[PDB]
Amino acid sequence: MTEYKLVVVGAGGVGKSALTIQLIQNHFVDEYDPTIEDSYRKQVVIDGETCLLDILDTAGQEEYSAMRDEYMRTGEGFLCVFAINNTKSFEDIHQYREQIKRVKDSDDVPMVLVGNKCDLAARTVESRQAQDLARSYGIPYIETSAKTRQGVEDAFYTLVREIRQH
Ligand SMILES: Nc1nc2c(ncn2[C@@H]2O[C@H](COP(=O)(O)OP(=O)(O)NP(=O)(O)O)[C@@H](O)[C@H]2O)c(=O)[nH]1
Ligand SMILES: [Ca+2]
Ligand SMILES: [Mg+2]
Ligand SMILES: [Mg+2]
Ligand SMILES: [Mg+2]
Incomplete structure (x- = not known):
């Protein structure tokens, strides 16, 4: 069946693991255990296609980010x-996109910009600001909450739909 290799990147603590675990295991991780490099695999039907998602959950903490490029590759x-x-x-996103471009040696890599923790009210990044950033990259912006599940499936499935357009 079709396999899609997805990689989740971003600063430490933004909720990469919680998002992946909510998608794959249907619960919210409340505690914060920094990740080194973890992988998840799940068979799912996306738009009528049975496929295998291989998701790499990467480190955001500089201390744990050793061979991250080798994984992202x-x-x-x-x-x-x-x-x-x-x-x-949010300001850090620029440097993750640059790293992705570097490891893939392409200016045209399937990507989705995700603004997580949308269940919280201490918002300092407004939707429009993020929409504009994503527009400049030619990619979708989607807000999510790993806590409530809002947007979680949408984010990961939209990424599959972006890979399918490339
Ligand atoms: N309220 C709320 N909290 C969240 C959300 N996502 C993650 N968190 C919380 O944020 C903390 C860090 O989440 P985590 O998934 O471990 O972040 P990470 O990006 O994987 N960290 P690292 O890069 O070090 O591996 C946890 O305490 C977690 O419960 C969210 O959508 N809403
Ligand atoms: Ca929990
Ligand atoms: Mg993590
Ligand atoms: Mg390279
Ligand atoms: Mg502001």
Whole structure:
């Protein structure tokens, strides 16, 4: 069956693991355990196609980010995640996109910009700001909450739909 290799990247603490775990395991991880490099695999039907998602959950903490580029290298599509209550994580997106372009040696990599923790009210990144960033990259912006599940399936499936357009 069709396999899609997805890679989730972004600053430490933005909720990359919580998003992936909500998608794959249907629960919310409340605690914060920094990730090194974890992978998840699940068979799902997306738009009538049975496919296998291989999701690489990467480190956002600089300390844990050792061979991250070697992992990212294999990815077919990337979720670039920031948190809507973490302005620095949004500003950091530029450098993740540059890293993706570097590891794929392409200016045209399937990507979706994700603004996570949308269940929280300490918003410092407004939707329009993120929409504009994504527009400049030619990719979709989607807000999510790993806590409530809002947008979670949408984000990951939209990434599959972007890979399919390339
Ligand atoms: N309220 C809320 N909290 C969230 C959300 N997503 C993640 N969190 C919380 O944010 C903290 C960090 O989440 P985590 O998924 O571990 O972040 P990460 O990006 O994978 N961190 P790292 O890069 O170090 O591996 C956790 O305490 C988690 O519960 C969300 O959508 N809403
Ligand atoms: Ca929990
Ligand atoms: Mg993590
Ligand atoms: Mg390269
Ligand atoms: Mg502002």
